[PDB]
């Protein structure tokens, strides 16, 4: 099953495809790799997130780690920042 | 004189001054049958006149060419002969008349 | 790099100097990994520098006959090599 | 209202052309079958010709019939010559295409499109 | 007579042609070339594609001349927008335009020969063409249909080593030309096959709309790089190689000279290329730089809109002609205010030339026709469009 | 010259459209409505003639959307009801004209919200 | 400026007949081809010495991944709105982390034109166009790449891509 | 006939007393770039992205709240009313977070367009 | 970022436009020099051979070469097709556009007599848009398939046509087939709704 499901039901005839063949499926799910990352602690109320790069990363957005209740997550990297 | 007019077809024409005078003079006439005030007659007679004016004012070909501001005279002729044909053709198509039909409405509005 | 005799074979048979103009790149070639570059980048209101909006909708428009433009000046034979 | 004629002035005048094409085609079908080694029979083909010349048999605007002839003649030229191969000519026979049913119950029974 | 349909697959010409012929014995009575064998619908598809996403249609019209086809469109879209490319970009387009004329001519002269039967000139020059491709690959990223001469400039600056490598190629290329020169110019066999074949008279060439080396080969003086200058050609010096006796040979000799004259223009461009940026930088027309779009909001909005929607060029229509290696390549772009064009008539130097084949190849045998197509440098992408 | 004819200039036989795409297909002349998501009124000014929506299905192999309606991506743009009805009648399609819906004039005043 | 290209004493007449009868002028061509069998062929040993390329070389697509391991693609649709061959379908969802990612991504590599309009539009450097050009296939189905033949593809060349991105980022 | 006459870059339209400057431009057909003004919502004047320049007048007025008066010619594409938009758009964008490839009002943005046009 | 232009041209050409309009008053409906510095003389369809002959053979306006002949199709206009002829004067180094209007059922004359370049372009206009050229030697499809039905560049023709081809073993021939596309072409409605200030 791909990180996004897709697993064919046993009855699905769409399974012949993989006979004498196999299924291209990436073992490195980004749902988990990003969870295997340390919440980036910060001092400032707001922080940037250039994507760990200038022009080699993602557009630069400032995240409001203002509530410890929630670790801001840049919509691009999925990196949680711990105030 | 000139061994070869550059352009392939146009062949060296001896007696350039003469060929021209005849072609230009014929034309100055065909225009005559045109309505008194028809731009063509009014303008083409203005040109043909200036060229006949130089064709007879200067007797050196190379010189003449610069004045007529054409290419090799063998060309100034090629053109003189074609205007004559347009002049004959124009007197039949009577372009001087009023417009045939005004465009249908909105037949020339690009940002449509 | 070829035995001089063999290459003099190619210079004599060709009739032209051939060690000079190689069709093969030995050290002639620029090496890869060129140092990183730094490309070159008030009153800069776009309303002054508007190419797009500067254009206007097309103009619609005794007397002496006028040519479309002054007759083209005839070219002249090349000084370095008139005939080749 | 007034309209310039393409080539014919009255529908009757034009039909003269329509017939001068029918004849041409008819007298050509036999040739094609043989030349392009087509397999359909002379009769069969000649049938198609009438069908087409017939399909268009309802327009009354001379200019349109003046125009379909031309297109029509052009198609002869190509066919008279062998500019068109077997594939081209045989395409007039929907050999592979399964003719679509028309009965409502026959369509409702297959395909959401009407 | 005998209708031998020259092979659509036949190795001769560009393999996308039919050319039904009437064989009056050995000689050919008439030719009726049946092009259309490669009409992909280029002009129809462009109407459904934005101005940037149509540039690619152009490098694929005359695939031998890549960046000059684009230079037309790019000039046409610039004129509609009333914006001009920056100074460095204009020199780069002239630098790349001359490399394309050398590569088109190496294509035309060498392939004409293999049709005639000379096989070695093609191999020696094609290695010289792979060196030139590498220049396209090392500036654009592709060896072909680079899509580098975009509206407003080139897409990216020249890499740090390109101009030195173009000097080394241009330095030694001249010997490669006359090496082909000695092989084909004086041979009995080539002159007989080419001289006095397909003579076209001067007025007939203008009337048939030939507009190319076919026009200049007959002695007419017209280049479109010196008559109606584009870009910065007005600042580079070159000699048009006109010719007399409009015959295949004179046309061959002209094509060999333009390769030499282009080396003179490439020489000036390397010697005088200005420091500057490669694309006009009003972000409305050319996309914002990678660092700017990732740090400033106005640039992200301008990148998003330009890539997703388009330039939205002002309503109008223009016919812009540049001297493509084959001849005058022109785009009649009709534009509504929309981001995607309304019509784009690609004038192909080649639709006119192939029409001339029947007139030019008259009183000629089957073998002459192979030379007649070869001397029109016709590639069927431009004709078929 | 100047022959006279009385047809609605049906060029249905010069167009070249397969019968079934000229018979069972209804064009819908209409002035596109505004994208509530934006407030720009420049996309609601020219009359469009779009055709009926037929089957859009799924390619078994990759899951893409496939279709057999050749006239699916067709949105001819006219400049007036009159010129759209004419084209549809010209080509032999059936039409469903929809009158334009310009917002009526709604009077707006700043002070009004200060009354009591 | 224009240039003409093609425009008897016994010494000359004999010279002409010495170049027509005892052909001496087709000999200046035979020695010209004899000048080349003795040179070094330009052929490269192909499979072992692949030809030269540039960090700009546009080939097989791939989806880069953030060093952390988070897919870079945030399903903008800024890369099929420009793809002129109309090759890409990137149907997306919230991925159940609350984040924003693809459930679908696609190239039909039998429609793509390797124009790189997708690598220069991507504001995040997710989709690139790698330096592969040995990926021929015996079948049609192996070219309709999915998000997992582009992501593990990008999980392959990332050592080889990033060097070329870092090598050309300034010029871009 | 209480129409009052007012000039839109010269078209000289005639409008009911009490129509806003923005409304006067609409009947000629011109669109004032606008934010915070919705036809069926009260005029607020918050954005002031609609500043225009009535003629021979000292300052720019808000087309959303200014009642057009008699014989004021609106100049919607002047050299001033463009610096009054080139400089407002500078501000809206300044504090804006650049996540347009997150903002699902990507092509449905009345703020990128007006930035991208005015 | 503002084109380097010469006003000399606008004027010179404008003046020629008045010259042509005076010399041919009967056929020219509107003459305008656009701001791109190009000229366009719009002629009644009947003026196609008179207007082009005057330009091909007049000493003060020699327009020897036909750059191209194309037909924009604006479906709204009654006369949809707008045949446009672009001509070049080698003598005066200037170019002109003569554009006339033709409907589906009203043919316009053929200039093959005036310029033999048009023999092919006119065939392409017939094949692509369906305009018919009167007394044109050998008008017949230049670009489309031998059996193609319909004129392709018409705005009312589907991008992808109605027929496609495949090889059918059962019949051993390349058979046509109603078009079924595996991925319809996503039509993007990309067009902003905020108009640009002129
Ligand atoms: C006074 C003493 C007593 C009397 C003694 C006798 C009188 C004097 C005799 C002098 C003889 C001079 C040479 C004559 C024989 C040579 C062949 C010949 O005559 O030339 C014919 C032809 C010329 O070609 P072209 O320029 O077109 O001339 C015709 C113009 N309408 O030539 C050709 O074009 C043929 C070309 C064919 C392709 C040739 C390719 C090169 C071949 C290289 C071969 C190398 C090896 C040759 C030796 C082999 C030995 C086994
Ligand atoms: C085998 C190859 C097949 C190729 C077939 C052929 O080439 C294609 C073709 O028919 S080319 C178009 C013919 N179409 C017309 O020629 C117009 C007919 N015009 C009418 O039919 C009128 O409505 C009329 C009033 C005459 C009815 O009268 P009538 O019923 O004919 O009698
Ligand atoms: S690839 Fe780059 S562009 Fe295409 S969607 Fe993912 S992020 Fe947006
Ligand atoms: S390369 Fe060009 S074509 Fe291939 S996907 Fe990226 S954009 Fe679409
Ligand atoms: S889309 Fe409009 S709103 Fe969403 S971010 Fe980009 S600009 Fe701000
Ligand atoms: S629109 Fe914001 S106040 Fe006029
Ligand atoms: Zn981030």
The DSSP bridge partners found for residue G102 are G92
Task: Copy the structure tokens of residue E93.
Answer: 């387009």
Residue D73 burial (10 A CB sphere; 0-12, 13-18, 19+): middle
| Bridging pattern class, strands H51-54 and H73-75 | antiparallel
- For F55, phi then psi, to 5°, come to -65, 125
The total of structural domains in chain A comes to 1
Chain E: residues touching C (Cβ < 8 Å):
80-84, 124, 127-128, 131, 157, 159-161, 164-165, 168, 171-172, 174-176, 178-179, 182, 221, 226-227, 239-241, 257, 275-277, 280-282, 284-285, 313-316
The parent domain of residue A49 ranges over: 1-83
Sign of the C-alpha dihedral, residues D98, D104, D106, D108? positive
Q: Out of E188, E189, E192, give the residue to mutate to test ligand 1, the one with the largest number of ligand atoms within 8 Å of its CB.
A: E188
d(CA G115, CA E145): 8
3-state secondary structure A13-31: HHHHHHCCCCCCCCCCCHH
E strand map for chain E: 2-5, 20-24, 27-32, 316-323, 328-335, 343-347
Domain ranges, ordered by start, for chain F: 1-116
Q: Ligand 3 centre from E154 Cα, in Å?
A: 24
Residue among B8, B12, B109 with most chain E CBs within 10 A, to mutate: B8
Of the candidates I154, I150, I151, I115, the residue with the CA atom closest to the CA atom of residue I136 = I115
DSSP for chain H reads ---EE-EETT---EE-TT-BHHHHHHHHT-----SS--TTS----SS---EEEETT-SS-EETTTPBP-TTPEEETTSTTTTHHHHTTHHHHHHT----TTT-S-SSS-TTHHHHHH-
d(CA D77, CA F12): 24
| Bridging pattern class, strands I94-99 and I81-89 | antiparallel
C2 CB contacts (<8 Å, ≥6 apart)?
Answer: C10, G38, G39, G40
Residue among E218, E219, E338 with most chain B CBs within 10 A, to mutate: E219
- Please compute, for residue I65, the number of CA atoms within 13 A of its CA located in the half-sphere on the CB side: 25
G122 CB contacts (<8 Å, ≥6 apart)?
Answer: G76, G78, G79, G128
Instruction: Give the CA radius of gyration of chain D.
Output: 18
Question: Is the Cβ–Cβ distance between C60 and I13 less than 8 Å?
Answer: no
Question: Is the Cβ–Cβ distance between B64 and B19 less than 8 Å?
Answer: no
Query: What element of type H or E holds G101?
Result: strand G100-102
Q: What is the greatest pairwise CA distance in chain H?
A: 52
- For E284, phi then psi, to 5°, come to -65, -35
Q: Tell me if residue E382 falls in helix, strand or coil.
A: helix
Angle, vertex CA G100, rays to CA G99 and CA G104, nearest 5: 130
Count the Cβ atoms, other than its own, within 10 Å of residue E196. 13
CATH of the domain at E98: 1.10.645.10
3-state secondary structure B62-95: HHHHHHHCCCCHHHHHHHHHHHHHHHHHHHHHCC
DSSP for E22-44 reads EEETTEEEEEE----TT---HHH
The parent domain of residue E79 ranges over: 1-385
Question: Is the Cβ–Cβ distance between B73 and B13 less than 8 Å?
Answer: yes
Q: Is the CB of residue G124 below 6 angstroms from any atom belonging to ligand 3?
A: yes
Task: Copy the structure tokens of residue B110.
Answer: 């690009």
Dihedral of the alpha carbons of E232, E234, E239, E242, in degrees to the nearest 10: 100
Q: What residue in I sits closest to E229 (Cα-Cα)?
A: I93
Sign of the C-alpha dihedral, residues E273, E274, E279, E284? negative
d(CA I148, CA D92): 11
d(CA E150, CA G120): 13
d(CA H64, CA H46): 10
**Helix ranges restricted to H, A6-82:** 30-33
Method by which this entry was solved: cryo-EM
d(CA I83, CA A73): 59
Of the candidates G125, G20, G84, the residue with the CA atom closest to the CA atom of residue E307 = G84
d(CA E344, CA F114): 57
d(CA E325, CA E214): 11
Question: First CA to last CA across chain I, in angstroms?
Answer: 17
The DSSP bridge partners found for residue G100 are G94
Cβ-nearest to C22 among E160, E172, E284: E172
CB-based contacts of H76-79 (< 8 A; 24+ apart in sequence) = H76/H8, H76/H9, H76/H25, H76/H30, H76/H32, H76/H52, H76/I197, H77/H9, H77/I197, H77/I198, H78/H53, H79/C47
Q: In what order do the strands lie in the sheet with E328-335?
A: E316-323, E328-335, E343-347
d(CA D42, CA D34): 9
Question: For ligand 4, what atom is nearest to the CA of residue G121?
Answer: 7
On whether any CB of chain A is under 8 Å from the CB of G140, the answer is no
With b for 16 or more beta-carbon neighbours within 10 A and e for fewer, the G77-109 pattern comes to bbbbbbbbbbbbbbebeebeeebbbbbbbbbbb
Question: Is the Cβ–Cβ distance between B103 and I28 less than 8 Å?
Answer: no
Q: Is the CB of residue G117 below 6 angstroms from any atom belonging to ligand 4?
A: yes
Q: Tell me if residue I135 falls in helix, strand or coil.
A: coil
Give the relative orientation of helices E162-184 and E248-271 as an angle to the nearest 10 degrees. Answer: 160
E strand map for chain A: 46-47, 63-64, 72-73, 80-81
G1 CB contacts (<8 Å, ≥6 apart)?
Answer: C75, C76, C77, C78, E226, E237, E238, E239, E240
Count the Cβ atoms, other than its own, within 10 Å of residue E200. 23
Question: Is the Cβ–Cβ distance between I85 and I40 less than 8 Å?
Answer: no
Distance from CA of B37 to the nearest CA of E (A): 32
Name the one residue in this structure whose structure tokens are 């046309």. Answer: E251
Ligand nearest the Cα of residue G100 is 3
The DSSP bridge partners found for residue I71 are I83
Of the candidates A24, E2, I135, E354, the residue with the CA atom closest to the CA atom of residue G105 = A24
The DSSP bridge partners found for residue F4 are D2
| Bridging pattern class, strands F94-95 and G106-108 | unpaired
**Helix ranges restricted to H, F42-100:** 81-91
Question: Is the Cβ–Cβ distance between I7 and C31 less than 8 Å?
Answer: no
| Bridging pattern class, strands F26-30 and F3-4 | unpaired
Name the one residue in this structure whose structure tokens are 């205010």. Answer: E337
Question: Is the Cβ–Cβ distance between F29 and F19 less than 8 Å?
Answer: no
With b for 16 or more beta-carbon neighbours within 10 A and e for fewer, the F3-23 pattern comes to bebeeebbbbbbbbbbeebbe
E strand map for I45-172: 65-73, 81-89, 94-99, 108-109, 133-134, 163-168
The parent domain of residue D11 ranges over: 1-114
Q: What is the greatest pairwise CA distance in chain C?
A: 84
Inter-chain residue contact E141 with G5, CB threshold 8 Å:
no
Of the candidates E315, E307, E372, the residue with the CA atom closest to the CA atom of residue E341 = E315
Task: Copy the structure tokens of residue I31.
Answer: 């003459």
What 8-state DSSP symbol labels residue C30?
A: P
Ligand nearest the Cα of residue A72 is 7
Inter-chain residue contact C24 with G42, CB threshold 8 Å:
yes
Question: For ligand 1, what atom is nearest to the CA of residue G23?
Answer: 32
Count the Cβ atoms, other than its own, within 10 Å of residue H54. 23
Ligand nearest the Cα of residue H34 is 6
Question: Is the Cβ–Cβ distance between I2 and E83 less than 8 Å?
Answer: yes
On whether any CB of chain C is under 8 Å from the CB of B43, the answer is yes
d(CA F4, CA F9): 12
The total of structural domains in chain D comes to 1
Angle, vertex CA E64, rays to CA E231 and CA E188, nearest 5: 110
- For I173, phi then psi, to 5°, come to -150, 160
Question: Is the Cβ–Cβ distance between E184 and E113 less than 8 Å?
Answer: yes
């Amino acid at each position: 099953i791909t990180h996004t499901g897709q697993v064919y039901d046993e009855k699905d005839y769409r399974r012949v495809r993989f006979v004498d063949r196999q299924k291209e499926v990436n073992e490195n799910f980004a749902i988990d790799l990003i969870a295997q990352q340390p919440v980036n602690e910060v001092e400032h109320r707001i922080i940037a997130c250039d994507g760990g790069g200038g022009a080699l990363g993602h557009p630069k957005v400032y995240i409001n780690l203002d509530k410890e209740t929630k670790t801001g997550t840049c919509g691009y990297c999925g990196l949680q920042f711990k105030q | 004189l000139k061994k070869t007019t550059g352009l392939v077809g146009l062949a060296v024409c001896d007696t350039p001054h003469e060929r021209l005078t005849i072609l230009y003079t014929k034309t100055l006439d065909i225009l005559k049958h045109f309505p008194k005030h028809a731009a063509y007659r009014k303008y083409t007679e203005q040109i043909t006149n200036e060229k006949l004016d130089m064709v007879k004012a200067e007797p050196d070909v190379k010189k003449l060419e610069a004045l007529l501001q054409g290419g090799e005279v063998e060309e100034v002729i090629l053109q003189a002969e074609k205007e004559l044909s347009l002049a004959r053709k124009m007197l039949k198509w009577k372009p001087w008349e009023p417009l045939v039909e005004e465009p249908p409405a909105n037949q020339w509005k690009w940002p449509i | 790099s070829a035995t001089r005799v063999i290459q003099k074979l190619r210079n004599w048979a060709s009739g032209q100097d051939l060690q000079a103009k190689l069709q093969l790149r030995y050290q002639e070639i620029a090496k890869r990994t060129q140092p990183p570059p730094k490309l070159p980048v008030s009153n800069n209101y776009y309303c002054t520098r508007d190419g797009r909006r500067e254009v206007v909708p097309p103009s619609i428009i005794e007397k002496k006959a006028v040519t479309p433009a002054p007759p083209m000046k005839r070219w002249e034979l090349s000084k370095d090599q008139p005939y080749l | 209202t007034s309209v310039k004629p393409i080539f014919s002035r009255d529908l009757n005048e034009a039909k003269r052309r329509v017939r001068e094409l029918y004849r041409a085609w008819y007298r050509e079908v036999p040739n094609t079958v043989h030349l392009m080694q087509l397999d359909i029979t002379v009769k069969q083909g000649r049938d198609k010709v009438r069908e087409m010349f017939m399909k268009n048999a309802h327009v009354t605007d001379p200019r349109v019939v003046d125009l379909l002839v031309i297109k029509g003649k052009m198609e002869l030229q190509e066919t008279i010559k062998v500019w068109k191969q077997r594939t081209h000519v045989m395409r007039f026979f929907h050999e592979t295409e399964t003719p679509r049913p028309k009965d409502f119950l026959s369509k409702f029974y297959m395909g959401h499109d009407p | 007579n005998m209708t031998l349909n020259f092979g659509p697959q036949h190795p001769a010409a560009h393999g996308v042609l039919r050319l039904v012929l009437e064989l009056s014995g050995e000689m050919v009575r008439k030719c009726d070339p049946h092009i259309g064998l490669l009409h992909r619908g280029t002009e129809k598809l462009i109407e459904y594609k934005t101005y940037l996403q149509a540039l690619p249609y152009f490098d694929r019209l005359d695939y031998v001349s890549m960046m000059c086809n684009e230079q037309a469109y790019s000039i046409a879209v610039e004129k509609l927008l009333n914006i001009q490319p920056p100074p460095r970009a204009q020199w780069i387009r002239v630098l790349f335009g001359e490399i394309t004329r050398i590569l088109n001519h190496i294509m035309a002269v060498t392939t004409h020969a293999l049709d005639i039967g000379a096989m070695t000139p093609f191999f020696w020059m094609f290695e010289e063409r792979e060196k030139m491709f590498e220049f396209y690959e090392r500036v654009s990223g592709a060896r072909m249909h680079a899509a580098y001469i975009r509206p407003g400039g080139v897409h990216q600056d020249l890499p740090l080593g390109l101009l030195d490598d173009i000097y080394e190629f241009s330095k030694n290329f001249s010997l490669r030309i006359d090496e082909v020169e000695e092989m084909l110019t004086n041979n009995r066999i080539w002159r007989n096959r080419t001289v006095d074949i397909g003579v076209v008279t001067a007025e007939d060439a203008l009337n048939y709309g030939f507009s190319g080396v076919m026009l200049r080969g007959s002695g007419i003086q017209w280049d479109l790089r010196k008559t109606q200058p584009y870009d910065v050609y007005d600042q580079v010096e070159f000699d048009v190689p006109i010719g007399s006796r409009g015959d295949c040979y004179d046309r061959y000799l002209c094509r060999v000279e333009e390769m030499r004259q282009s080396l003179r223009i490439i020489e000036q461009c390397l010697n005088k290329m200005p420091p500057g940026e490669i694309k006009v930088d009003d972000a409305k027309v050319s996309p914002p730089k990678r660092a700017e779009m990732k740090t400033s909001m106005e640039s992200l909005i301008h990148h998003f809109k330009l890539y997703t929607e388009g330039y939205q060029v002002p309503p109008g229509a223009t016919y812009t002609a540049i001297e493509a290696p084959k001849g005058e390549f022109g785009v009649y772009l009709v534009s509504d205010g929309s981001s995607r064009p309304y019509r784009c008539k690609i004038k192909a130097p080649g639709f006119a030339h192939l029409a001339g084949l029947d007139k030019m190849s008259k009183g000629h045998m089957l073998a002459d026709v192979v030379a007649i197509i070869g001397t029109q440098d016709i590639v069927f992408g431009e004709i078929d469009r | 010259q100047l022959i006279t004819v009385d047809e609605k200039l049906d060029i249905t036989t010069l167009t070249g459209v397969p019968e079934e795409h000229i018979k069972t297909r209804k064009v819908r002349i209409f002035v596109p409505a505004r994208n509530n998501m934006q407030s720009g009124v420049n996309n609601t000014k020219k009359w469009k003639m779009e055709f009926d929506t037929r089957e859009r299905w799924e390619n078994p192999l990759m899951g893409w959307a496939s279709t057999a309606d050749p006239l699916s991506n067709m949105v001819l743009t006219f400049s007036a009801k009159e010129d759209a009805i004419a084209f549809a009648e010209k080509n032999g399609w059936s039409y469903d004209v929809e009158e334009k819906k310009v917002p009526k004039p709604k009077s707006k005043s700043y002070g009004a919200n200060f009354s009591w | 400026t224009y240039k003409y290209v093609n425009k008897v004493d016994m010494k000359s007449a004999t010279d002409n007949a010495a170049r027509i009868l005892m052909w001496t002028e087709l000999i200046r061509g035979l020695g010209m081809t004899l000048s080349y069998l003795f040179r070094e062929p330009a052929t490269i040993n192909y499979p072992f010495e692949k030809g030269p390329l540039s960090p700009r070389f546009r080939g097989e697509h791939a989806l880069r991944r953030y060093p952390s391991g988070e897919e870079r693609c945030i399903a903008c649709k800024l890369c099929e709105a420009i793809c002129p061959a109309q090759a890409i379908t990137i149907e997306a969802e919230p991925r159940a982390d609350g984040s924003r990612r693809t459930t679908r991504y696609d190239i039909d590599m039998t429609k793509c034109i390797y124009c790189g309009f997708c690598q220069e539009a991507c504001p995040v450097d997710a989709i690139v166009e790698g330096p592969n050009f040995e990926f021929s296939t015996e079948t049609h189905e192996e070219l309709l790449y999915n998000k997992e033949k582009l992501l593990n593809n990008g999980d392959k060349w990332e050592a080889e891509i990033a060097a070329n991105i870092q090598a050309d980022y300034l010029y871009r | 006939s209480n129409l009052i006459e007012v000039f839109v870059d010269g078209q000289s339209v005639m409008v009911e007393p009490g129509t806003t400057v923005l409304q006067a431009c609409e009947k000629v057909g011109m669109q004032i770039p606008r934010f915070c003004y919705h036809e069926r919502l009260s005029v607020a004047g918050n954005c002031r992205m609609c500043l225009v320049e009535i003629e021979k007048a000292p300052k720019v007025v808000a087309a959303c709240a200014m009642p057009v008066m008699k014989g004021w010619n609106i100049l919607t594409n002047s050299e001033k009313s463009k610096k009054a938009r080139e400089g407002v758009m500078e501000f809206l964008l300044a504090n804006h977070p650049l996540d347009c490839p997150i903002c699902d009002q990507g092509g449905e943005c009345d703020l990128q367009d007006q930035s991208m046009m005015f | 970022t503002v084109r380097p232009r010469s006003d000399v041209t606008h004027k010179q050409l404008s003046a020629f436009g008045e010259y042509v309009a005076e010399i041919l008053p009967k056929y020219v409906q509107q003459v305008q020099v656009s701001c791109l510095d190009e000229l366009e003389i719009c002629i009644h369809p009947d003026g196609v051979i008179p207007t082009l002959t005057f330009l091909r053979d007049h000493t003060n306006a020699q327009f020897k070469s036909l750059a191209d002949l194309t037909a924009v199709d604006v479906p709204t206009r009654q006369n949809r097709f707008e045949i446009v002829y672009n001509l070049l004067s080698l003598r005066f180094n200037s170019r002109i556009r003569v554009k006339t209007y033709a409907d589906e059922l009203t043919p316009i004359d053929s200039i093959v007599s005036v310029h033999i370049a048009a023999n092919w372009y006119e065939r392409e206009v017939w094949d692509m848009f369906g305009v018919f050229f009167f007394n044109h030697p050998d008008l017949r499809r230049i670009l489309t398939d031998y059996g193609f039905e319909g004129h392709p560049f018409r705005k009312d023709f589907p991008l992808t046509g109605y027929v496609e081809l495949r090889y059918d073993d059962e019949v051993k021939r390349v058979v046509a087939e109603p078009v079924e596309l595996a991925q319809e072409f996503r039509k993007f409605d990309l067009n902003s709704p905020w108009e640009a200030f002129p």
